[PDB]
mmCIF file of N, CA and C in Angstrom:
data_model
loop_
_atom_site.group_PDB
_atom_site.id
_atom_site.type_symbol
_atom_site.label_atom_id
_atom_site.label_comp_id
_atom_site.label_asym_id
_atom_site.label_seq_id
_atom_site.Cartn_x
_atom_site.Cartn_y
_atom_site.Cartn_z
ATOM 1 N N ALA Q 1 15.906 -15.899 10.615
ATOM 2 C CA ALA Q 1 15.913 -15.386 11.972
ATOM 3 C C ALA Q 1 15.369 -14.311 12.392
ATOM 4 N N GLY Q 2 13.999 -14.265 13.964
ATOM 5 C CA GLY Q 2 12.788 -13.010 13.972
ATOM 6 C C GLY Q 2 14.288 -11.617 14.350
ATOM 7 N N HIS Q 3 13.912 -10.766 13.844
ATOM 8 C CA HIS Q 3 14.412 -9.883 13.836
ATOM 9 C C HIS Q 3 14.093 -8.244 14.074
ATOM 10 N N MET Q 4 14.477 -7.188 14.556
ATOM 11 C CA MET Q 4 13.709 -6.108 14.912
ATOM 12 C C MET Q 4 14.165 -5.214 13.973
ATOM 13 N N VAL Q 5 15.194 -5.067 12.797
ATOM 14 C CA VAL Q 5 15.803 -4.508 11.274
ATOM 15 C C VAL Q 5 16.201 -5.362 10.039
ATOM 16 N N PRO Q 6 14.510 -5.403 9.664
ATOM 17 C CA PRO Q 6 14.562 -5.951 7.981
ATOM 18 C C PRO Q 6 15.281 -4.960 7.115
ATOM 19 N N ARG Q 7 15.457 -5.537 5.525
ATOM 20 C CA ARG Q 7 16.098 -4.952 4.691
ATOM 21 C C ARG Q 7 15.342 -5.394 3.708
ATOM 22 N N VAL Q 8 14.523 -4.104 3.189
ATOM 23 C CA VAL Q 8 14.256 -3.902 1.761
ATOM 24 C C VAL Q 8 14.563 -4.884 0.634
ATOM 25 N N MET Q 9 14.829 -6.059 0.020
ATOM 26 C CA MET Q 9 15.787 -6.384 -1.258
ATOM 27 C C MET Q 9 14.924 -6.418 -2.670
ATOM 28 N N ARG Q 10 13.899 -6.013 -3.126
ATOM 29 C CA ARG Q 10 13.631 -6.192 -4.121
ATOM 30 C C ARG Q 10 12.097 -5.087 -4.513
ATOM 31 N N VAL Q 11 11.769 -4.263 -5.079
ATOM 32 C CA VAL Q 11 9.874 -3.434 -4.889
ATOM 33 C C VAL Q 11 9.793 -3.735 -6.009
ATOM 34 N N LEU Q 12 8.992 -3.188 -6.247
ATOM 35 C CA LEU Q 12 7.687 -3.535 -7.551
ATOM 36 C C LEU Q 12 6.163 -3.084 -7.423
ATOM 37 N N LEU Q 13 6.102 -2.000 -8.695
ATOM 38 C CA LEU Q 13 4.807 -1.707 -8.814
ATOM 39 C C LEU Q 13 3.756 -2.243 -9.776
ATOM 40 N N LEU Q 14 2.564 -2.884 -9.457
ATOM 41 C CA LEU Q 14 1.810 -3.410 -10.761
ATOM 42 C C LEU Q 14 0.770 -2.910 -10.811
ATOM 43 N N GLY Q 15 -0.124 -2.112 -10.380
ATOM 44 C CA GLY Q 15 -0.927 -0.964 -10.322
ATOM 45 C C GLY Q 15 -0.656 -0.164 -10.886
ATOM 46 N N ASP Q 16 -1.552 -0.494 -12.675
ATOM 47 C CA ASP Q 16 -0.898 1.058 -13.556
ATOM 48 C C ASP Q 16 -1.533 2.437 -13.075
ATOM 49 N N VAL Q 17 -0.871 3.332 -13.801
ATOM 50 C CA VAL Q 17 -1.804 4.422 -13.710
ATOM 51 C C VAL Q 17 -2.715 5.621 -14.369
ATOM 52 N N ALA Q 18 -2.591 4.307 -15.897
ATOM 53 C CA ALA Q 18 -3.805 4.973 -16.871
ATOM 54 C C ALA Q 18 -5.061 5.675 -15.991
ATOM 55 N N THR Q 19 -5.285 4.632 -15.332
ATOM 56 C CA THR Q 19 -6.793 4.818 -14.592
ATOM 57 C C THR Q 19 -7.163 6.463 -13.101
ATOM 58 N N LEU Q 20 -5.339 6.466 -12.956
ATOM 59 C CA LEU Q 20 -5.243 7.465 -11.883
ATOM 60 C C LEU Q 20 -3.865 8.369 -12.085
ATOM 61 N N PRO Q 21 -5.251 9.698 -13.174
ATOM 62 C CA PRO Q 21 -3.992 10.572 -13.680
ATOM 63 C C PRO Q 21 -3.441 11.589 -12.113
ATOM 64 N N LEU Q 22 -2.860 12.662 -12.680
ATOM 65 C CA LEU Q 22 -2.360 14.072 -11.682
ATOM 66 C C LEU Q 22 -3.008 14.102 -10.110
ATOM 67 N N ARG Q 23 -4.795 14.568 -10.862
ATOM 68 C CA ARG Q 23 -5.839 14.246 -9.718
ATOM 69 C C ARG Q 23 -5.946 13.160 -8.495
ATOM 70 N N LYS Q 24 -5.639 11.913 -9.451
ATOM 71 C CA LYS Q 24 -5.691 10.470 -8.460
ATOM 72 C C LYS Q 24 -4.877 10.603 -7.686
ATOM 73 N N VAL Q 25 -3.336 10.336 -8.211
ATOM 74 C CA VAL Q 25 -1.966 10.014 -8.406
ATOM 75 C C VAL Q 25 -2.011 11.130 -6.642
ATOM 76 N N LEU Q 26 -2.368 12.614 -6.707
ATOM 77 C CA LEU Q 26 -2.439 14.011 -6.185
ATOM 78 C C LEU Q 26 -2.953 12.831 -4.344
ATOM 79 N N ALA Q 27 -4.397 13.355 -5.042
ATOM 80 C CA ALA Q 27 -5.453 12.473 -4.525
ATOM 81 C C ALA Q 27 -4.818 11.654 -3.466
ATOM 82 N N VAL Q 28 -5.102 10.712 -3.625
ATOM 83 C CA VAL Q 28 -4.373 9.352 -3.431
ATOM 84 C C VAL Q 28 -2.668 9.224 -2.089
ATOM 85 N N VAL Q 29 -1.857 9.143 -3.237
ATOM 86 C CA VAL Q 29 -0.093 9.713 -2.982
ATOM 87 C C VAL Q 29 -0.455 10.521 -2.021
ATOM 88 N N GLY Q 30 -0.926 11.766 -1.493
ATOM 89 C CA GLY Q 30 -1.286 12.741 -0.893
ATOM 90 C C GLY Q 30 -1.804 11.797 0.371
ATOM 91 N N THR Q 31 -2.793 11.947 0.689
ATOM 92 C CA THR Q 31 -3.545 11.272 2.105
ATOM 93 C C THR Q 31 -3.197 10.297 2.380
ATOM 94 N N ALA Q 32 -2.945 9.034 1.014
ATOM 95 C CA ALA Q 32 -1.776 7.629 1.573
ATOM 96 C C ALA Q 32 -0.243 8.095 2.356
ATOM 97 N N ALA Q 33 0.509 9.177 1.569
ATOM 98 C CA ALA Q 33 1.032 9.407 2.230
ATOM 99 C C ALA Q 33 1.473 9.807 4.016
ATOM 100 N N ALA Q 34 0.704 10.360 3.515
ATOM 101 C CA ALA Q 34 0.590 11.226 4.941
ATOM 102 C C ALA Q 34 -0.201 10.665 6.302
ATOM 103 N N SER Q 35 -0.918 9.401 5.840
ATOM 104 C CA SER Q 35 -1.300 8.773 6.547
ATOM 105 C C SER Q 35 0.261 7.705 7.064
ATOM 106 N N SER Q 36 1.166 7.499 6.150
ATOM 107 C CA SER Q 36 1.850 6.568 7.094
ATOM 108 C C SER Q 36 3.288 7.012 7.564
ATOM 109 N N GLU Q 37 4.408 6.694 8.135
ATOM 110 C CA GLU Q 37 5.572 7.065 8.049
ATOM 111 C C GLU Q 37 6.947 6.952 8.131
ATOM 112 N N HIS Q 38 6.751 6.221 7.208
ATOM 113 C CA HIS Q 38 8.272 6.306 5.805
ATOM 114 C C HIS Q 38 8.798 7.182 5.768
ATOM 115 N N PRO Q 39 10.018 7.323 5.203
ATOM 116 C CA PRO Q 39 11.318 8.102 5.426
ATOM 117 C C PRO Q 39 11.291 9.611 4.702
ATOM 118 N N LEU Q 40 10.306 9.007 3.737
ATOM 119 C CA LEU Q 40 10.022 10.216 2.735
ATOM 120 C C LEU Q 40 8.094 10.565 2.433
ATOM 121 N N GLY Q 41 7.620 10.574 3.929
ATOM 122 C CA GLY Q 41 7.206 11.373 4.566
ATOM 123 C C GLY Q 41 7.092 13.561 3.957
ATOM 124 N N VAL Q 42 7.551 13.750 5.038
ATOM 125 C CA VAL Q 42 8.286 14.588 4.640
ATOM 126 C C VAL Q 42 8.267 15.114 3.267
ATOM 127 N N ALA Q 43 8.676 14.308 2.180
ATOM 128 C CA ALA Q 43 9.126 14.517 1.100
ATOM 129 C C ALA Q 43 7.899 14.492 0.523
ATOM 130 N N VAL Q 44 6.595 13.551 0.122
ATOM 131 C CA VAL Q 44 5.457 13.134 -0.137
ATOM 132 C C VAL Q 44 4.315 13.886 -0.109
ATOM 133 N N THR Q 45 4.885 14.362 1.544
ATOM 134 C CA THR Q 45 3.837 15.467 2.191
ATOM 135 C C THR Q 45 3.672 17.017 1.472
ATOM 136 N N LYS Q 46 5.670 18.039 1.501
ATOM 137 C CA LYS Q 46 5.483 18.813 1.150
ATOM 138 C C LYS Q 46 5.465 18.755 -1.020
ATOM 139 N N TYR Q 47 5.187 17.607 -1.072
ATOM 140 C CA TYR Q 47 5.640 17.820 -2.606
ATOM 141 C C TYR Q 47 3.470 18.076 -3.148
ATOM 142 N N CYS Q 48 2.575 16.519 -2.542
ATOM 143 C CA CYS Q 48 1.289 17.050 -2.833
ATOM 144 C C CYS Q 48 0.627 18.162 -2.195
ATOM 145 N N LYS Q 49 1.136 18.813 -0.827
ATOM 146 C CA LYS Q 49 0.656 19.869 -0.122
ATOM 147 C C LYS Q 49 1.119 21.431 -1.698
ATOM 148 N N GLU Q 50 1.973 21.787 -1.953
ATOM 149 C CA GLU Q 50 2.469 22.351 -2.780
ATOM 150 C C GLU Q 50 1.288 21.987 -3.886
ATOM 151 N N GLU Q 51 1.599 21.087 -4.472
ATOM 152 C CA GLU Q 51 0.605 20.395 -5.664
ATOM 153 C C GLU Q 51 -0.818 21.054 -5.618
ATOM 154 N N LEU Q 52 -1.335 20.754 -4.188
ATOM 155 C CA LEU Q 52 -2.996 20.657 -4.008
ATOM 156 C C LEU Q 52 -2.769 22.699 -3.439
ATOM 157 N N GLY Q 53 -1.701 22.726 -2.520
ATOM 158 C CA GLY Q 53 -2.017 23.751 -1.859
ATOM 159 C C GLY Q 53 -2.627 24.307 -1.073
ATOM 160 N N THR Q 54 -2.921 22.744 -0.532
ATOM 161 C CA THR Q 54 -3.520 22.415 0.789
ATOM 162 C C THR Q 54 -2.458 21.908 1.948
ATOM 163 N N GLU Q 55 -2.777 21.921 2.933
ATOM 164 C CA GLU Q 55 -2.259 21.443 4.098
ATOM 165 C C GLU Q 55 -2.478 20.136 4.559
ATOM 166 N N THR Q 56 -3.953 20.281 4.703
ATOM 167 C CA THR Q 56 -4.722 18.715 4.866
ATOM 168 C C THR Q 56 -5.174 17.840 4.412
ATOM 169 N N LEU Q 57 -4.076 16.834 5.530
ATOM 170 C CA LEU Q 57 -3.561 15.467 4.609
ATOM 171 C C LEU Q 57 -3.575 14.412 5.740
ATOM 172 N N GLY Q 58 -4.376 13.465 4.929
ATOM 173 C CA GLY Q 58 -4.066 11.862 6.499
ATOM 174 C C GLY Q 58 -4.742 12.084 6.502
ATOM 175 N N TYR Q 59 -6.363 11.645 6.480
ATOM 176 C CA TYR Q 59 -8.254 11.375 6.265
ATOM 177 C C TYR Q 59 -8.298 10.876 7.271
ATOM 178 N N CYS Q 60 -8.302 9.874 8.124
ATOM 179 C CA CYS Q 60 -9.203 8.078 7.869
ATOM 180 C C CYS Q 60 -10.528 7.947 7.609
ATOM 181 N N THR Q 61 -10.872 7.185 6.981
ATOM 182 C CA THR Q 61 -12.652 7.067 6.322
ATOM 183 C C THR Q 61 -13.048 5.702 7.239
ATOM 184 N N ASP Q 62 -11.846 4.644 6.497
ATOM 185 C CA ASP Q 62 -12.891 3.287 6.159
ATOM 186 C C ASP Q 62 -11.699 2.486 7.477
ATOM 187 N N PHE Q 63 -11.567 1.217 7.568
ATOM 188 C CA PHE Q 63 -11.036 0.721 9.171
ATOM 189 C C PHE Q 63 -11.449 -0.408 8.675
ATOM 190 N N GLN Q 64 -10.056 -1.371 8.436
ATOM 191 C CA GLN Q 64 -10.569 -2.923 9.101
ATOM 192 C C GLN Q 64 -9.056 -3.215 9.621
ATOM 193 N N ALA Q 65 -9.375 -3.983 10.211
ATOM 194 C CA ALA Q 65 -8.252 -4.746 10.821
ATOM 195 C C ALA Q 65 -8.293 -6.571 10.253
ATOM 196 N N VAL Q 66 -6.998 -7.150 10.359
ATOM 197 C CA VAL Q 66 -6.338 -8.433 9.896
ATOM 198 C C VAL Q 66 -5.383 -9.169 10.664
ATOM 199 N N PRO Q 67 -5.772 -9.460 12.016
ATOM 200 C CA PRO Q 67 -4.540 -10.331 12.812
ATOM 201 C C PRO Q 67 -4.155 -11.600 12.099
ATOM 202 N N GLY Q 68 -3.423 -11.622 10.755
ATOM 203 C CA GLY Q 68 -3.075 -12.844 10.870
ATOM 204 C C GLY Q 68 -2.998 -12.575 9.316
ATOM 205 N N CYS Q 69 -2.993 -11.721 8.447
ATOM 206 C CA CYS Q 69 -3.090 -11.320 6.952
ATOM 207 C C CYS Q 69 -2.134 -10.058 6.788
ATOM 208 N N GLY Q 70 -3.136 -9.230 7.188
ATOM 209 C CA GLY Q 70 -2.250 -7.532 7.858
ATOM 210 C C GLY Q 70 -3.442 -7.103 7.980
ATOM 211 N N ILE Q 71 -3.184 -5.161 7.332
ATOM 212 C CA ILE Q 71 -4.452 -4.816 7.594
ATOM 213 C C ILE Q 71 -4.151 -3.744 6.459
ATOM 214 N N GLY Q 72 -6.046 -2.760 6.273
ATOM 215 C CA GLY Q 72 -6.172 -1.956 5.297
ATOM 216 C C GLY Q 72 -6.832 -1.168 5.560
ATOM 217 N N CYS Q 73 -7.366 0.537 5.042
ATOM 218 C CA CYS Q 73 -8.204 1.157 5.454
ATOM 219 C C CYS Q 73 -8.064 2.021 3.787
ATOM 220 N N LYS Q 74 -9.138 2.805 4.780
ATOM 221 C CA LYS Q 74 -9.727 4.533 3.096
ATOM 222 C C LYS Q 74 -9.387 5.018 3.931
ATOM 223 N N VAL Q 75 -8.343 5.587 3.285
ATOM 224 C CA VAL Q 75 -7.920 7.021 3.774
ATOM 225 C C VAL Q 75 -8.084 7.929 2.291
ATOM 226 N N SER Q 76 -8.294 9.699 3.047
ATOM 227 C CA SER Q 76 -8.415 10.856 1.803
ATOM 228 C C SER Q 76 -8.817 11.903 2.435
ATOM 229 N N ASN Q 77 -8.242 13.075 1.823
ATOM 230 C CA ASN Q 77 -8.177 13.982 2.369
ATOM 231 C C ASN Q 77 -9.360 15.356 1.459
ATOM 232 N N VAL Q 78 -9.506 14.571 0.163
ATOM 233 C CA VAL Q 78 -9.958 14.915 -1.187
ATOM 234 C C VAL Q 78 -11.374 15.795 -0.936
ATOM 235 N N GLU Q 79 -11.951 14.854 0.183
ATOM 236 C CA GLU Q 79 -13.373 15.041 0.158
ATOM 237 C C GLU Q 79 -13.906 15.964 1.347
ATOM 238 N N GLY Q 80 -12.703 15.881 2.138
ATOM 239 C CA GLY Q 80 -12.673 17.415 3.316
ATOM 240 C C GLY Q 80 -12.579 18.573 2.219
ATOM 241 N N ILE Q 81 -11.237 18.419 1.287
ATOM 242 C CA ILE Q 81 -11.031 19.916 0.864
ATOM 243 C C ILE Q 81 -11.728 20.002 -0.020
ATOM 244 N N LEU Q 82 -12.049 19.593 -1.479
ATOM 245 C CA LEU Q 82 -12.658 19.333 -2.453
ATOM 246 C C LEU Q 82 -14.803 19.319 -2.088
ATOM 247 N N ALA Q 83 -14.948 18.478 -0.817
ATOM 248 C CA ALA Q 83 -16.065 18.624 -0.359
ATOM 249 C C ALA Q 83 -16.916 18.510 -1.042
ATOM 250 N N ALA Q 84 -16.823 17.979 -2.483
ATOM 251 C CA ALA Q 84 -18.017 17.793 -3.454
ATOM 252 C C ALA Q 84 -17.874 15.773 -4.259
ATOM 253 N N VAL Q 85 -16.441 15.388 -4.306
ATOM 254 C CA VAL Q 85 -16.261 14.665 -4.470
ATOM 255 C C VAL Q 85 -15.542 13.637 -4.287
ATOM 256 N N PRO Q 86 -15.895 12.655 -3.250
ATOM 257 C CA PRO Q 86 -15.398 12.501 -2.065
ATOM 258 C C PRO Q 86 -14.708 10.870 -2.501
ATOM 259 N N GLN Q 87 -13.408 10.576 -2.180
ATOM 260 C CA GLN Q 87 -13.567 9.004 -2.580
ATOM 261 C C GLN Q 87 -12.048 8.672 -1.374
ATOM 262 N N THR Q 88 -12.907 7.142 -1.144
ATOM 263 C CA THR Q 88 -12.066 6.387 0.199
ATOM 264 C C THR Q 88 -11.200 6.214 -0.967
ATOM 265 N N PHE Q 89 -9.825 6.531 -0.827
ATOM 266 C CA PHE Q 89 -8.785 5.502 -1.434
ATOM 267 C C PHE Q 89 -8.212 4.650 -0.368
ATOM 268 N N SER Q 90 -8.838 2.993 -0.534
ATOM 269 C CA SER Q 90 -8.323 2.036 0.408
ATOM 270 C C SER Q 90 -7.451 1.060 -0.568
ATOM 271 N N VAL Q 91 -6.677 1.241 1.252
ATOM 272 C CA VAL Q 91 -4.768 0.655 1.273
ATOM 273 C C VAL Q 91 -4.951 -0.500 2.093
ATOM 274 N N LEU Q 92 -4.635 -1.597 1.227
ATOM 275 C CA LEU Q 92 -4.080 -2.595 2.618
ATOM 276 C C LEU Q 92 -2.893 -3.266 2.247
ATOM 277 N N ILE Q 93 -2.385 -3.911 3.203
ATOM 278 C CA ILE Q 93 -0.708 -4.108 3.653
ATOM 279 C C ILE Q 93 -0.784 -5.977 4.172
ATOM 280 N N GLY Q 94 0.283 -6.963 3.001
ATOM 281 C CA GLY Q 94 -0.310 -7.994 4.043
ATOM 282 C C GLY Q 94 0.669 -8.717 2.948
ATOM 283 N N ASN Q 95 0.885 -10.213 3.561
ATOM 284 C CA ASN Q 95 2.211 -10.908 3.003
ATOM 285 C C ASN Q 95 0.850 -12.040 2.327
ATOM 286 N N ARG Q 96 1.501 -13.134 1.479
ATOM 287 C CA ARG Q 96 1.410 -13.977 0.882
ATOM 288 C C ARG Q 96 0.004 -14.904 1.484
ATOM 289 N N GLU Q 97 -0.176 -14.630 2.670
ATOM 290 C CA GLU Q 97 -1.795 -15.220 3.048
ATOM 291 C C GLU Q 97 -2.576 -13.490 2.625
ATOM 292 N N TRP Q 98 -3.083 -12.511 3.136
ATOM 293 C CA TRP Q 98 -3.905 -11.410 2.412
ATOM 294 C C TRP Q 98 -3.658 -11.815 1.414
ATOM 295 N N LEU Q 99 -2.427 -11.197 0.182
ATOM 296 C CA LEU Q 99 -2.546 -11.642 -1.411
ATOM 297 C C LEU Q 99 -3.241 -12.330 -1.669
ATOM 298 N N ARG Q 100 -2.858 -13.228 -1.150
ATOM 299 C CA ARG Q 100 -3.999 -14.775 -1.674
ATOM 300 C C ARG Q 100 -5.409 -14.680 -0.955
ATOM 301 N N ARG Q 101 -5.690 -14.286 0.252
ATOM 302 C CA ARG Q 101 -7.373 -14.257 0.580
ATOM 303 C C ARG Q 101 -8.120 -13.570 -0.154
ATOM 304 N N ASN Q 102 -7.468 -11.648 -0.140
ATOM 305 C CA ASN Q 102 -8.488 -11.252 -1.704
ATOM 306 C C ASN Q 102 -7.667 -11.623 -3.284
ATOM 307 N N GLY Q 103 -5.915 -12.384 -3.530
ATOM 308 C CA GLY Q 103 -6.052 -12.452 -4.797
ATOM 309 C C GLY Q 103 -7.373 -14.108 -5.590
ATOM 310 N N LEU Q 104 -7.177 -14.508 -4.659
ATOM 311 C CA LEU Q 104 -8.127 -16.207 -5.403
ATOM 312 C C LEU Q 104 -8.464 -16.802 -3.917
ATOM 313 N N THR Q 105 -8.580 -18.390 -4.978
ATOM 314 C CA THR Q 105 -9.310 -19.547 -3.216
ATOM 315 C C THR Q 105 -7.634 -19.831 -2.906
ATOM 316 N N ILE Q 106 -7.082 -21.031 -3.448
ATOM 317 C CA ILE Q 106 -5.734 -22.006 -3.120
ATOM 318 C C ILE Q 106 -5.223 -21.792 -4.158
ATOM 319 N N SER Q 107 -3.808 -21.944 -3.839
ATOM 320 C CA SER Q 107 -3.015 -22.330 -5.306
ATOM 321 C C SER Q 107 -2.174 -22.792 -4.474
ATOM 322 N N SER Q 108 -1.134 -24.473 -4.578
ATOM 323 C CA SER Q 108 -0.522 -25.087 -4.309
ATOM 324 C C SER Q 108 0.740 -24.975 -4.886
ATOM 325 N N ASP Q 109 0.508 -24.242 -5.612
ATOM 326 C CA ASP Q 109 1.684 -23.611 -6.630
ATOM 327 C C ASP Q 109 2.220 -21.992 -6.048
ATOM 328 N N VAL Q 110 1.246 -21.272 -5.920
ATOM 329 C CA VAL Q 110 1.348 -20.117 -5.236
ATOM 330 C C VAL Q 110 2.293 -20.193 -3.784
ATOM 331 N N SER Q 111 1.339 -21.219 -3.248
ATOM 332 C CA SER Q 111 1.883 -21.643 -1.872
ATOM 333 C C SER Q 111 3.093 -21.908 -1.901
ATOM 334 N N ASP Q 112 3.300 -23.158 -2.221
ATOM 335 C CA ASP Q 112 4.987 -24.007 -2.538
ATOM 336 C C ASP Q 112 5.869 -23.047 -3.132
ATOM 337 N N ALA Q 113 6.064 -22.236 -4.406
ATOM 338 C CA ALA Q 113 6.623 -21.319 -4.840
ATOM 339 C C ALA Q 113 7.055 -20.283 -3.014
ATOM 340 N N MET Q 114 6.555 -19.477 -2.916
ATOM 341 C CA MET Q 114 6.177 -18.442 -1.872
ATOM 342 C C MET Q 114 7.128 -19.028 -0.845
ATOM 343 N N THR Q 115 6.723 -20.377 0.219
ATOM 344 C CA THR Q 115 7.728 -21.393 0.428
ATOM 345 C C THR Q 115 8.677 -21.231 0.247
ATOM 346 N N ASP Q 116 8.731 -21.732 -1.015
ATOM 347 C CA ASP Q 116 10.209 -22.297 -0.965
ATOM 348 C C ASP Q 116 11.271 -21.361 -1.174
ATOM 349 N N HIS Q 117 10.886 -20.024 -1.488
ATOM 350 C CA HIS Q 117 12.222 -19.346 -1.550
ATOM 351 C C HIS Q 117 11.886 -18.697 -0.411
ATOM 352 N N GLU Q 118 11.888 -18.796 0.652
ATOM 353 C CA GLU Q 118 11.006 -17.809 1.848
ATOM 354 C C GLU Q 118 12.041 -18.842 2.244
ATOM 355 N N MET Q 119 12.601 -19.837 2.297
ATOM 356 C CA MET Q 119 13.654 -20.439 2.809
ATOM 357 C C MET Q 119 15.383 -19.944 2.819
ATOM 358 N N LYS Q 120 14.970 -19.124 2.161
ATOM 359 C CA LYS Q 120 16.534 -17.915 2.134
ATOM 360 C C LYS Q 120 16.067 -17.128 3.202
ATOM 361 N N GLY Q 121 15.127 -16.470 3.583
ATOM 362 C CA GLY Q 121 14.670 -15.550 4.609
ATOM 363 C C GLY Q 121 14.291 -14.308 4.825
ATOM 364 N N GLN Q 122 13.680 -14.773 3.050
ATOM 365 C CA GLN Q 122 12.862 -13.397 1.757
ATOM 366 C C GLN Q 122 11.205 -12.806 3.155
ATOM 367 N N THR Q 123 11.159 -12.376 3.335
ATOM 368 C CA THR Q 123 9.555 -11.565 2.892
ATOM 369 C C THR Q 123 9.133 -11.071 2.194
ATOM 370 N N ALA Q 124 7.432 -11.706 1.920
ATOM 371 C CA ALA Q 124 6.517 -10.969 1.630
ATOM 372 C C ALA Q 124 6.173 -10.764 1.841
ATOM 373 N N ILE Q 125 5.372 -8.759 1.491
ATOM 374 C CA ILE Q 125 4.934 -7.784 1.682
ATOM 375 C C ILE Q 125 4.640 -6.893 0.509
ATOM 376 N N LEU Q 126 3.864 -7.267 0.233
ATOM 377 C CA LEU Q 126 3.146 -6.202 -1.290
ATOM 378 C C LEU Q 126 1.242 -5.126 -0.216
ATOM 379 N N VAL Q 127 1.406 -4.650 -1.124
ATOM 380 C CA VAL Q 127 -0.030 -3.743 -0.658
ATOM 381 C C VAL Q 127 -0.653 -2.910 -1.655
ATOM 382 N N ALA Q 128 -1.931 -3.818 -1.636
ATOM 383 C CA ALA Q 128 -2.787 -2.849 -2.285
ATOM 384 C C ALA Q 128 -3.959 -1.970 -2.024
ATOM 385 N N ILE Q 129 -4.333 -1.784 -3.775
ATOM 386 C CA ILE Q 129 -4.551 0.052 -3.065
ATOM 387 C C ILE Q 129 -6.393 0.060 -4.348
ATOM 388 N N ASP Q 130 -7.265 0.206 -3.483
ATOM 389 C CA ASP Q 130 -8.283 0.342 -4.251
ATOM 390 C C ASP Q 130 -9.288 -1.183 -4.747
ATOM 391 N N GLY Q 131 -8.145 -2.048 -4.328
ATOM 392 C CA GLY Q 131 -8.921 -3.336 -4.201
ATOM 393 C C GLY Q 131 -7.989 -3.549 -5.936
ATOM 394 N N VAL Q 132 -6.409 -3.377 -5.426
ATOM 395 C CA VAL Q 132 -5.979 -3.768 -7.051
ATOM 396 C C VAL Q 132 -4.387 -3.721 -6.008
ATOM 397 N N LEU Q 133 -3.770 -4.813 -6.675
ATOM 398 C CA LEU Q 133 -2.016 -5.052 -5.664
ATOM 399 C C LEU Q 133 -1.284 -3.715 -6.703
ATOM 400 N N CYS Q 134 -0.904 -2.655 -6.007
ATOM 401 C CA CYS Q 134 -0.504 -1.136 -6.387
ATOM 402 C C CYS Q 134 0.792 -1.868 -6.255
ATOM 403 N N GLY Q 135 1.480 -2.673 -5.646
ATOM 404 C CA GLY Q 135 2.548 -2.562 -5.751
ATOM 405 C C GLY Q 135 3.004 -3.525 -4.578
ATOM 406 N N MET Q 136 4.212 -4.000 -4.428
ATOM 407 C CA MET Q 136 4.852 -5.502 -3.806
ATOM 408 C C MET Q 136 6.298 -4.886 -3.327
ATOM 409 N N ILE Q 137 6.782 -5.848 -2.019
ATOM 410 C CA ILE Q 137 7.701 -5.477 -1.528
ATOM 411 C C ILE Q 137 8.598 -6.840 -0.845
ATOM 412 N N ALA Q 138 9.920 -7.046 -1.783
ATOM 413 C CA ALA Q 138 9.964 -8.667 -0.716
ATOM 414 C C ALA Q 138 11.630 -8.161 -0.334
ATOM 415 N N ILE Q 139 11.372 -8.385 1.288
ATOM 416 C CA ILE Q 139 12.546 -8.040 2.377
ATOM 417 C C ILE Q 139 13.423 -9.519 2.149
ATOM 418 N N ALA Q 140 14.039 -9.230 2.659
ATOM 419 C CA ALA Q 140 15.598 -10.333 2.542
ATOM 420 C C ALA Q 140 16.342 -10.147 4.095
ATOM 421 N N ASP Q 141 15.642 -11.144 5.008
ATOM 422 C CA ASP Q 141 16.076 -11.073 5.869
ATOM 423 C C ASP Q 141 17.202 -12.174 6.436
#
């Protein structure tokens, strides 16, 4: 059913953090979160703000629109701060469509499975970071 009151069912993270140390996570989560509207914005904001010592975050560098699959863009304040080692943190969000659009060519098993479970009213919404699925969310409507 189409409604303006969804409800997250399950959330998992794929993109590891090995290559993303305190510095990476700080900058990424910093700007990334600063460019979000989640109810945890204030939290992440104050956190990265106290960890870096700067109130500058939420800079948009790259912009990519996708009317039909999702959206994506690169945001990072690290460049404006350090002003020496700029790193555009790419962040895209979409459903099975986008996930597959960049995940692979086509899979009857993946599409069939997605639609198979979607019959329960569940919505597929994952987010990729740096061209790599960082996390995936599954809503239950």
